[PDB]
Design an enzyme around this catalytic site. Structure first.
Site, PDB file in Angstrom:
ATOM      1  N   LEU A   1       0.890  -1.204   0.000  1.00  0.00           N
ATOM      2  CA  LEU A   1       0.000   0.000   0.000  1.00  0.00           C
ATOM      3  C   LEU A   1       0.926   1.252   0.000  1.00  0.00           C
ATOM      4  O   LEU A   1       1.957   1.231   0.689  1.00  0.00           O
ATOM      5  CB  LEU A   1      -0.787   0.120   1.269  1.00  0.00           C
ATOM      6  CG  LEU A   1      -1.748  -0.840   1.878  1.00  0.00           C
ATOM      7  CD1 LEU A   1      -2.136  -0.198   3.221  1.00  0.00           C
ATOM      8  CD2 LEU A   1      -2.947  -1.073   0.999  1.00  0.00           C
TER       9      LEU A   1
ATOM     10  N   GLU B   1      -8.592   1.553   9.185  1.00  0.00           N
ATOM     11  CA  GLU B   1      -8.944   1.425   7.748  1.00  0.00           C
ATOM     12  C   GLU B   1      -9.129  -0.078   7.527  1.00  0.00           C
ATOM     13  O   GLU B   1     -10.070  -0.547   6.905  1.00  0.00           O
ATOM     14  CB  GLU B   1      -7.937   2.072   6.830  1.00  0.00           C
ATOM     15  CG  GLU B   1      -8.592   2.606   5.556  1.00  0.00           C
ATOM     16  CD  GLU B   1      -9.094   1.513   4.675  1.00  0.00           C
ATOM     17  OE1 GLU B   1     -10.196   1.523   4.161  1.00  0.00           O
ATOM     18  OE2 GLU B   1      -8.268   0.589   4.455  1.00  0.00           O
TER      19      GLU B   1
HETATM   20  C1  LIG Z   1      -0.344  -4.881   5.086  1.00  0.00           C
HETATM   21  O1  LIG Z   1      -1.317  -5.597   5.833  1.00  0.00           O
HETATM   22  C2  LIG Z   1      -2.444  -5.976   5.176  1.00  0.00           C
HETATM   23  C3  LIG Z   1      -2.715  -5.619   3.875  1.00  0.00           C
HETATM   24  C4  LIG Z   1      -3.882  -6.095   3.297  1.00  0.00           C
HETATM   25  N1  LIG Z   1      -4.106  -5.635   2.013  1.00  0.00           N
HETATM   26  C5  LIG Z   1      -3.021  -4.946   1.349  1.00  0.00           C
HETATM   27  C6  LIG Z   1      -5.449  -5.721   1.446  1.00  0.00           C
HETATM   28  C7  LIG Z   1      -6.457  -4.603   1.857  1.00  0.00           C
HETATM   29  C8  LIG Z   1      -6.382  -3.940   3.101  1.00  0.00           C
HETATM   30  C9  LIG Z   1      -7.110  -2.727   3.270  1.00  0.00           C
HETATM   31  C10 LIG Z   1      -8.003  -2.319   2.284  1.00  0.00           C
HETATM   32  C11 LIG Z   1      -8.258  -3.124   1.145  1.00  0.00           C
HETATM   33  C12 LIG Z   1      -7.294  -4.125   0.845  1.00  0.00           C
HETATM   34  C13 LIG Z   1      -9.096  -2.491   0.148  1.00  0.00           C
HETATM   35  N2  LIG Z   1      -9.358  -2.999  -1.067  1.00  0.00           N
HETATM   36  N3  LIG Z   1      -9.933  -1.571   0.532  1.00  0.00           N
HETATM   37  C14 LIG Z   1      -9.803  -0.888   1.696  1.00  0.00           C
HETATM   38  N4  LIG Z   1     -10.399   0.282   1.777  1.00  0.00           N
HETATM   39  N5  LIG Z   1      -8.625  -1.084   2.428  1.00  0.00           N
HETATM   40  C15 LIG Z   1      -4.818  -6.882   3.981  1.00  0.00           C
HETATM   41  C16 LIG Z   1      -4.466  -7.275   5.292  1.00  0.00           C
HETATM   42  O2  LIG Z   1      -5.150  -8.088   6.253  1.00  0.00           O
HETATM   43  C17 LIG Z   1      -6.369  -8.546   5.619  1.00  0.00           C
HETATM   44  C18 LIG Z   1      -3.286  -6.801   5.892  1.00  0.00           C
HETATM   45  O3  LIG Z   1      -2.948  -7.148   7.219  1.00  0.00           O
HETATM   46  C19 LIG Z   1      -2.416  -5.999   7.884  1.00  0.00           C
END
Ligand SMILES: COc1cc(N(C)C[C@H]2CCC3=C(C2)C(N)=N[C@H](N)N3)cc(OC)c1OC
Length: 186
Positions: free
Chosen positions: A22, A30
């Protein structure tokens, strides 16, 4: 299959990811919001299906894969089988949905959520029919390499409010952001 929705966090430059990561520091609230939304079924006895690309799938810490409490569906045309930890694999959204229309998941799925990537977001936005955009707006520019396609306000209306979504500015790590819902039907 109930509702079709896309959920995304976009920076001010419209950035969704940088090197599979991200563009901004982790935002715990979030994350909670993203988990609550995708996991919460509008119907007892049913589960939500979360659809994502191979890149997105591999962008989540393993510790967190598959997204629990939900059916994980990865979309790929090069994989011949679902990644380790995933439940289903499709070649397209047209195919993933027909899968839903199978007696397989027929009677098990409520709402379907698309969690990424751009390509996946773009085929959902072409999918004729009812569609809801759940956007998290991070109020800063962030070096990104991948983007959220631009929203056509002539087709998507910004809702004045939505039950269960906070309308005012949030802040975590000196970073400001707000929640938005857009709805289409064409
Ligand atoms: C780096 O840590 C993590 C990353 C992720 N990603 C990147 C997917 C996500 C996380 C947040 C998000 C998603 C995708 C999205 N499409 N819409 C909203 N608005 N926000 C998911 C994680 O746990 C499930 C995680 O654990 C901490």
């Amino acid at each position: 299959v109930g509702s079709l929705n896309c959920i995304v966090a976009v920076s001010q430059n419209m950035g969704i990811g940088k090197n599979g990561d991200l563009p901004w520091p982790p935002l715990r609230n979030e994350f909670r919001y993203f988990q609550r939304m995708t996991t919460t079924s509008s119907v007892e006895g049913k589960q939500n299906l979360v659809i994502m690309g191979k890149k997105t799938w591999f962008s989540i810490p393993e510790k967190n894969r598959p997204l629990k409490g939900r059916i994980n569906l990865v979309l790929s045309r090069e994989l011949k089988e679902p990644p380790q930890g995933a439940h289903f694999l499709s070649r397209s959204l047209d195919d993933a949905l027909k899968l839903t229309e199978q007696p397989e998941l027929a009677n098990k799925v409520d709402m379907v959520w698309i969690v990424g990537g751009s390509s996946v977001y773009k085929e959902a936005m072409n999918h004729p029919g009812h569609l809801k955009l759940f956007v998290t707006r991070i109020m800063q520019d962030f070096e990104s390499d991948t983007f959220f396609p631009e929203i056509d306000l002539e087709k998507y209306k910004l809702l004045p409010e939505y039950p269960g979504v906070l309308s005012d500015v949030q802040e975590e790590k000196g970073i400001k952001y707000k929640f938005e819902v857009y709805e289409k039907n064409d």
